[PDB]
Amino acid sequence: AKLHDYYKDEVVKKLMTEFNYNSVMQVPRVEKITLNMGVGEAIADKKLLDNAAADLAAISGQKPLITKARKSVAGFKIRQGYPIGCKVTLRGERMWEFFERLITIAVPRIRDFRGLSAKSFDGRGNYSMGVREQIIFPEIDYDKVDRVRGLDITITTTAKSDEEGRALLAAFDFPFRK
Amino acid sequence: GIREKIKLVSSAGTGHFYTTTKNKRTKPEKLELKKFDPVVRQHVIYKEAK
Amino acid sequence: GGSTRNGRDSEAKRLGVKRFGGESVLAGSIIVRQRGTKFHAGANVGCGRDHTLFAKADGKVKFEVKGPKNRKFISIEAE
Amino acid sequence: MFTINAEVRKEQGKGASRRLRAANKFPAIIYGGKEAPLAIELDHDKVMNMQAKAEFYSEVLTIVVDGKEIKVKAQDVQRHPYKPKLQHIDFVRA
Amino acid sequence: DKKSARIRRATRARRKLQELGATRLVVHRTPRHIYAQVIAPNGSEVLVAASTVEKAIAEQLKYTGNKDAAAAVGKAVAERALEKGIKDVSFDRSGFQYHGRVQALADAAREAGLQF
Amino acid sequence: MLQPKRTKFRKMHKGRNRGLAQGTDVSFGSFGLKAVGRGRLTARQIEAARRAMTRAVKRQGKIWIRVFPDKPITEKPLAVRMGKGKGNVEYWVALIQPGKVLYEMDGVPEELAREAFKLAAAKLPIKTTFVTKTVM
RNA sequence: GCCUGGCGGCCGUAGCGCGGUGGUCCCACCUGACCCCAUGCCGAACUCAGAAGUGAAACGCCGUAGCGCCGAUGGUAGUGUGGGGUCUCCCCAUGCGAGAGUAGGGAACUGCCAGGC
RNA sequence: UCCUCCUAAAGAGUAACGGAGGAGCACGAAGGUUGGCUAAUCCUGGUCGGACAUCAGGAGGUUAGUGCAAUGGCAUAAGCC
RNA sequence: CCGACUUACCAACCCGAUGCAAACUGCGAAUACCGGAGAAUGUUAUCACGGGAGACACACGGCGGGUGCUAACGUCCGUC
RNA sequence: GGGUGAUUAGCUCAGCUGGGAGAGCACCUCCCUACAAGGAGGGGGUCGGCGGUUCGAUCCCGUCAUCACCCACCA
């Protein structure tokens, strides 16, 4: 696959051919991004978040899911059997296709971009790179917009180290805060 | 109770009506399910529930 | 009160105990108000979700402990 | 604790235990040290006066069985619930 | 592992086909190889075995996991089962989905004389 | 004095004493008092014995009491004809047996521990006897 | 023999962690999907054509008292029977005889078969 | 009047105007069936969430769930989709 | 923006000393209770239908429990 | 002891369906004059305690704590 064919030999060599590494698949790689969008907060109107998931076609190319809640909770007016979000989460093929679209082209459209992720790493690719209100990806003929729209995204790996993950997130271009 | 017994008509126009226990006067939901018939013994659509 | 009632425990006590049998039909592990404690095995097929050992035979009931979690199984004994 | 003597026993349990504990003998056992357990009977004379001193449990003991002498250590002491009497004792090999 | 949660989906059906008893065909598949092995009700003996590991497939087929390689095992286990005189008994597919290469093996076995 | 604050049940079998139970071995200190008979024990007797030892040893050493009441027991408040269910619980009770060690001490002289347990034994319904650590 | 893999036997002492190791063969990532087929989302399952790369994740096999798991001997508790008494319970004779506690075990055994060496 | 969990002694039966909790209906669905799924709770981290929502990982474990009360059955789930 | 003193102050989780459960069970008996084949002794003792009942109000001694003050020539039950 | 009921703002209570606490008077403060009064704002509740049933417990259940009252009847 066209992203990994480069990453498996041309970069991160310090965890493939240097000290304590002779196995080339022992370094972490990107496979999943935890993109989610909720709808269960609008449970008293029931129509406010009815078609919000149908206008994510600029941030997720996949078909949404119906979902169910985790627990029946009264002060959130929700039953366990009731819909809570729409998923739209990218794993595999459409995740690498989004990793080529994040922070690569919309570079003249940023508001501050002071470093994205600075802390809260742990071992599972815990690099939170969400926008804090969207910048809109370059697209044909758009003219009407809304307030307080954005996404939350972490590039979570099947790993146990974000110390070794700091070599993965230094194999590609990514800012960090200084 | 307040739920009470109710009889259904059929799409075959049977004299025999099908019985269930179901509310009409305070919580109507109706019923249409198809069941066994006593006239040719090959089932009929019991419907409407008054 | 009021009352603590005491009620009853009722009869219908266990039939599926020791090597015995019938003459035409046997339900060698039939029990009331309990399910999922005993099961059927061998080549003769017992009852469904209740797994009671039923047989159309003069043969006697067999008690075994078999397979995973050493579960209680019932069959018909060869003589 | 200078050397003590014991004898092998074959009759055991309740009535034989109470008939051994007749103000004259005690039951004992020797186990561990990569060898099988051995059941023995012990005369009351020395062992009771020996278990008065804490060195009986923190220093090894020499025991004679079948005329031959071996090293052991004290491990457990079973007592009587309503009289000051010894019921049974354990020794471990060294 | 990538097999235990598949095997879990057959436990109930295995225990229902235990009411008919008799032999189990043990159809098993991997991306490079397709297998079938008729075992006794007690696991103590085997009747017949066929796979895409055999010289009668491994030089005829371009890949030993191919759809035609599953059909080639189907007609091979059948001609052996007929020679061992195996009659009408139930089918055993190790928790795999029948539609695909498992059905390709079973249909090629039905035309080759397997009683199913 | 001396009872739990929550209970799963309070109506109980009175029961009888087997004469055995756990005990015999001193393991909180070096000296103690043993029951050496059968009888009945209350919290008021335990407190009267606690109040006795604190006159002999005052602030010296530590004092351990491995005993606490075994059951709630029901009583009716006036002399009465029995019937119409059991009464209520105002005290708990224990049955004690000869092997029970009641009280243990350590940081004190032996001739004072024995004298303090003699003073405490005067508060108890039965004859009681002095016990030592027995080196094990 | 030793291994790779399959479905079982037995119903755990067989495990998990930590450590050792292989891909030659087997196997799992992995290659490609536009193709025959599909997902309450998906090349996850499933489908279909595989071998550019890998022994990492995973997987099989193995070693080891950190943890999960299992406990002998004797004495004791309990008990069946017959006899005695200083009988709100005990003794004597005798068949049966725990559990905790202690010493210790502990990382299986394996049946049938195809293939690799 | 009817259902049991204890009293009950591991045959049956069985004592307190004793101890604990219920039924006199509801469910066309929680029914038939094909295929698929695995809890609670507690810890940390994650956008517009501000003890608490959307969810990610761990620890945890016949502690969730099942119309309705106790016990019994439940992962091949009878629980949920 | 998180630090230091005190505290028979508390504690998930794990453990030792220690004393415990009928309405608790991650261990666990002895007898009793019943079926089948078979022998020995017997009062044919058996099981079943037909004719006739009478009776369904009882005390005590061991064994073991509940209940009472482990009081009563007390009380409620099991067992022989 | 035995029984029948109850506990919400300082005080007297509304609201006893399992759905997010309310009135009058007081308090404190302004307009009216020094003030009861007339008017307008501002402020505080484990809705007695502790477990349990549940999506959810002032509310339903059990049991205490406190409060009010009836009964010590048969000779």
UniProtKB/Swiss-Prot annotation, chain A:
Q: Where are the transmembrane segments?
A: none
In UniProt terms, what function does this protein have? This is one of the proteins that bind and probably mediate the attachment of the 5S RNA into the large ribosomal subunit, where it forms part of the central protuberance. Its 5S rRNA binding is significantly enhanced in the presence of L18.
Q: Which GO terms describe its cellular component?
A: cytoplasm; cytosol; cytosolic large ribosomal subunit
Q: How does it assemble?
A: Part of the 50S ribosomal subunit; part of the 5S rRNA/L5/L18/L25 subcomplex. Contacts the 5S rRNA; cross-links to the P site tRNA. Forms a bridge to the 30S subunit in the 70S ribosome, contacting protein S13 and S19.
Q: Which HAMAP family match?
A: Ribosomal_uL5_B
Please report a single Pfam family linked to this protein.
Answer: Ribosomal_L5
Which InterPro entries does the entry mention? Ribosomal_uL5, Ribosomal_uL5_bac-type, Ribosomal_uL5_C, Ribosomal_uL5_CS, Ribosomal_uL5_dom_sf, Ribosomal_uL5_N
Q: Which GO terms describe its biological process?
A: cytoplasmic translation; ribosomal large subunit assembly; translation
What protein am I looking at?
Large ribosomal subunit protein uL5
Protein family membership: Belongs to the universal ribosomal protein uL5 family.
What are the record keywords, sorted?
Acetylation, Ribonucleoprotein, Ribosomal protein, RNA-binding, rRNA-binding, tRNA-binding
| Positions bearing N6-acetyllysine | 2
Q: Which domain of life is it from?
A: Bacteria
Keyword Nucleus on entry: no
Quote the record's miscellaneous comment: Identified as a multicopy suppressor of the slow growth phenotype of an rsgA (yjeQ) deletion mutant.
One function term, GO molecular function aspect: structural constituent of ribosome
UniProtKB/Swiss-Prot annotation, chain B:
Q: What else is known?
A: Surface exposed on the 50S subunit.
What does the annotation say about its assembly with partners?
Part of the 50S ribosomal subunit. Cross-links to the P and E site tRNAs.
Instruction: Supply the source organism for this entry.
Output: Escherichia coli (strain K12)
What family classification does the UniProt entry report for this protein? Belongs to the bacterial ribosomal protein bL33 family.
Q: Which GO terms describe its molecular function?
A: structural constituent of ribosome; tRNA binding
Per the record, the gene is rpmG
Q: Per the record, a Pfam family?
A: Ribosomal_L33
**Annotated signal sequence range:** none
Q: Which UniProt keywords apply?
A: Methylation, Ribonucleoprotein, Ribosomal protein, RNA-binding, tRNA-binding
GO CC annotation? cytoplasm; cytosol; cytosolic large ribosomal subunit
A biological process (GO) of this protein is:
ribosomal large subunit assembly
Q: What is this protein called?
A: Large ribosomal subunit protein bL33
Swiss-Prot record, chain C:
Which InterPro entries does UniProt cross-reference here? Ribosomal_bL27, Ribosomal_bL27_CS
Alphabetical list of SUPFAM superfamilies matching this protein: Ribosomal L27 protein-like
Record's keyword terms, sorted: Ribonucleoprotein, Ribosomal protein, RNA-binding, rRNA-binding, tRNA-binding
User: Do the record's keywords include Lipid biosynthesis?
Assistant: no
UniProt superkingdom: Bacteria
Matching Pfam families:
Ribosomal_L27
An example Gene Ontology molecular-function term: rRNA binding
One Gene Ontology cellular component term attached to this UniProt record is: cytoplasm
Report residue spans for region: Disordered. 1-14
Q: Name one GO biological process term.
A: assembly of large subunit precursor of preribosome
Q: Which PROSITE patterns match?
A: RIBOSOMAL_L27 (PS00831)
Family note: Belongs to the bacterial ribosomal protein bL27 family.
Its subunit composition reads:
Part of the 50S ribosomal subunit. Cross-links to the 23S rRNA. Cross-links to the A and P site tRNAs.
The record's annotation in NCBIfam families points to: L27
Question: What is the protein named?
Answer: Large ribosomal subunit protein bL27
- Protein's organism: Escherichia coli (strain K12)
Q: What is the lineage of its organism?
A: Bacteria, Pseudomonadati, Pseudomonadota, Gammaproteobacteria, Enterobacterales
Gene giving rise to this polypeptide = rpmA
From Swiss-Prot, chain D:
Does this entry carry the keyword Isomerase? no
Q: Which SUPFAM superfamilies match?
A: Ribosomal protein L25-like
Under the heading InterPro entries, the entry gives: Rbsml_bL25/Gln-tRNA_synth_N, Ribosomal_bL25/Gln-tRNA_synth, Ribosomal_bL25_short, Ribosomal_L25_dom, Ribosomal_uL5_bac-type
Q: Which keywords accompany this UniProt record?
A: Ribonucleoprotein, Ribosomal protein, RNA-binding, rRNA-binding
Any idea which GO molecular function terms this record carries?
5S rRNA binding; structural constituent of ribosome
Q: Does the keyword RNA-binding apply?
A: yes
Biological processes per GO annotation: cytoplasmic translation; negative regulation of translation; response to radiation; ribosomal large subunit assembly; translation
Gene Ontology cellular component annotations, sorted alphabetically? cytoplasm; cytosol; cytosolic large ribosomal subunit
Role of this protein = This is one of the proteins that binds to the 5S RNA in the ribosome where it forms part of the central protuberance. Binds to the 5S rRNA independently of L5 and L18. Not required for binding of the 5S rRNA/L5/L18 subcomplex to 23S rRNA.
Q: How does it assemble?
A: Part of the 50S ribosomal subunit; part of the 5S rRNA/L5/L18/L25 subcomplex. Contacts the 5S rRNA.
Family label? Belongs to the bacterial ribosomal protein bL25 family.
Q: Which PANTHER family match?
A: RIBOSOMAL PROTEIN L25/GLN-TRNA SYNTHETASE, ANTI-CODON-BINDING DOMAIN-CONTAINING PROTEIN, RIBOSOMAL PROTEIN L25_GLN-TRNA SYNTHETASE, ANTI-CODON-BINDING DOMAIN-CONTAINING PROTEIN
Name it: Large ribosomal subunit protein bL25
Give the organism, scientific name. Escherichia coli (strain K12)
What's the name of its gene? rplY
